[PDB]
A paper describes a structure:
Bacteriophage Casadabanvirus [name], from the order Caudoviricetes, is a temperate phage that infects the bacterium Pseudomonas aeruginosa. The virion of bacteriophage [name] is composed of an icosahedral capsid, long flexible non-contractile tail, and a baseplate. Using its baseplate, [name] attaches to Pseudomonas aeruginosa via the bacterial type IV pilus, whose subsequent retraction brings the phage to the bacterial cell surface.
The [name] [name] (gp32) has the same domain organization as portals of other dsDNA phages, such as T4, SPP1, and T7. It is composed of crown, wing, stem, and clip domains. The diameter of the portal channel at its narrowest is 30 Å in a virion and 21 Å in an empty [name] particle. The difference is caused by the conformational change of helices α12 from the wing domains and tunnel loops of the portal proteins.
Numbering used by the authors:
A (entry chain A), B (entry chain A): 5 to 409
The structure:
Amino acid sequence: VDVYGNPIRTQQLREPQTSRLAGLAKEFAQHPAKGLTPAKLARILVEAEQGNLQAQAELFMDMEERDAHLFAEMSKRKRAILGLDWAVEPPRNASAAEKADADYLHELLLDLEGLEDLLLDALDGIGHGYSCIELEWALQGREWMPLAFHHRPQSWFQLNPEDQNELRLRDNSPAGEALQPFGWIIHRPRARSGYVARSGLFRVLAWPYLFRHYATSDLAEMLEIYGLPIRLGKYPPGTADEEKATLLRAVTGLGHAAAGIIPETMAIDFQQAAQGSSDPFLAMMRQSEDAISKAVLGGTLTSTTSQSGGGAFALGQVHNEVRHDLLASDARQLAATLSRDLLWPLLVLNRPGSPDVRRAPRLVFDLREQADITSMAQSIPALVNVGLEIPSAWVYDKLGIPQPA
Amino acid sequence: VDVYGNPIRTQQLREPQTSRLAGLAKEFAQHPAKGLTPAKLARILVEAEQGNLQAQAELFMDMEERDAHLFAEMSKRKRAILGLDWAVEPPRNASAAEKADADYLHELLLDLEGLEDLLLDALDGIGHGYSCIELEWALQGREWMPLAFHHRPQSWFQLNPEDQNELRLRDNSPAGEALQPFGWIIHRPRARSGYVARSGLFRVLAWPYLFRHYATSDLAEMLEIYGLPIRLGKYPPGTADEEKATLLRAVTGLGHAAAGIIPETMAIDFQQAAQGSSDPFLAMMRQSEDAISKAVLGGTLTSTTSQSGGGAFALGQVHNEVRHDLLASDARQLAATLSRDLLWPLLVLNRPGSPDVRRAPRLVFDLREQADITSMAQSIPALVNVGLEIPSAWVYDKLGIPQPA
């Protein structure tokens, strides 16, 4: 059975759960981000907390699509994880059988195509708060294999009315449907303590995105209004409609027309419509950019060039440690969810026996940090000449040099 | 059969699929970018999401043509990949037969002309979200060969009404036509999780492009209006049409005419039409430039000179790591699509047997990063004198020095 203990029946693995819900596949996103206002966004968040995740997911998709800075930051964060080397390792002080099972799973994963896409789809849970991937199973003789990984939009799910922390499909029923065991991979990173609805990172970044959007739109309109000054023409009583239309045409053309003539009984005035500066909008956009960068990557230097020195070394150290521990946390969570959702079904479906869930293999990402080889090379001789016995295994491990074989 | 398992029939390889659709070849792009407004662009995106990819593809082509900064950034990104060395490597722990097949495919690819053009055409999927290249096959005796690679405009395809993730040709039918197996190379890089329509990078960059376009056009008009001030002439009652035309001519000429005379009963006033500055437009254009650079290359220094020091080292490290992992991701995706679409048909059509799809050869790009030879040279002697056995293979591999033969 799965790690959660739910009974597992192999009959349902032959067909995807969503196959019987063809209505979902034909849905088109409604794009709630267009014409968004603070009241509407607050309503969206409140209704999402009560189990209406569709609008929130669509809004998050639009938000990630429409913002270039948030796009770049999220892409950087995800590509940081995508570049890490991974391996499968048996349980602690494992035996020969457990070692063989771990090696077999490692072999299975190394050639498993689409793994990079699987990781990319799973990492969307950092922003959306949860990512669901459906597994398609097939039989190549006596062994079960995941034929393909299909990421499903977050708009397809909701919350259980009796459980705020449990996700369900949308099957036109108030209670939804429970997720099929051995049929989904669910990644739910925990940046904050709380329920699934409130756990998405995009919930924090929603407000700065709206601030930037409003500032940029207002700046664009103000750019549209500069240049020609607004001017108003006056006519005396007894002017006819033909002459008034002529005056309107003349006044409209005066902006691009260098000269014009009117009767002394008429008047036209110029007003300097805009008479403004863009500095407020720029400042607000910079504030939003800095907030988003700090929230996503934990720092701001990585996105913008620092125009100062002296403290650049301490800033670099802080940034490097923040990036390192953020990456470590994300990779550990991703490895945990992968080991929970993918490795266990393979182990229990392809290999004989019923191994304890306690001794199941765990996926591990390579979080080794490059060490300065020169410093170690110069330090070792003095220590060894003193008399200290430094194990060769530790030196190999820190330096990344593989053991002789 | 292909990697996707679809039955493959060699009869259809003799003619291109599009050959029977001569109407497509005669089509001319409609250039939707001219006279573009935010409402029109939003409509274009919305209709593209529903399966109307023609307008979106034409808009993306116009956008890449009309913007010099986006042009340069995309060219830099693609030429980064074009310069990487590549080789074909057999499956893991391969046998003699698999090694021979991989070597034969390597030989076939090395002399295969047009490979650089094939990579260039495939890399357009980064911006457009998908690039389709049609294969022309021929028989030189007993072996099949790709005679030529023909890139087709993205405006020729659409989405399956019953599948938002499946592409089809435009054959004047509502459902289109399914892509012929063994006849196309499809590259669909995945920057974000989502459907094919929303996966294009240009969708993110569309808005900053429009912002820059509007700012530059308004700045150009404002430049046109500076200089001569707008002036308005007045005449008293009883002025004749000849005299009014004369007054209009005089007022029009006063800008470039240093002097003029009019009756004391007439008046002319000067207004200082523009009385403005270009700073708002410059600031908006800089914002758009920075956004595009960050979205494309992950940084801004590579496109503009940094006017500060101190932190230049940390900024350079961040930029180098961002470029490295971005290039690695792009190259890995390109190699995956190439191995899926080009290597497998050659293996199954030119060589005997039916090798497992699991053991198929995979194209690999050279992602080795140059290591400082001096540091390694100075570090090795101390480590070896301590007693550590560092394999010569690892040193050769990191330093790029080939094995002795």
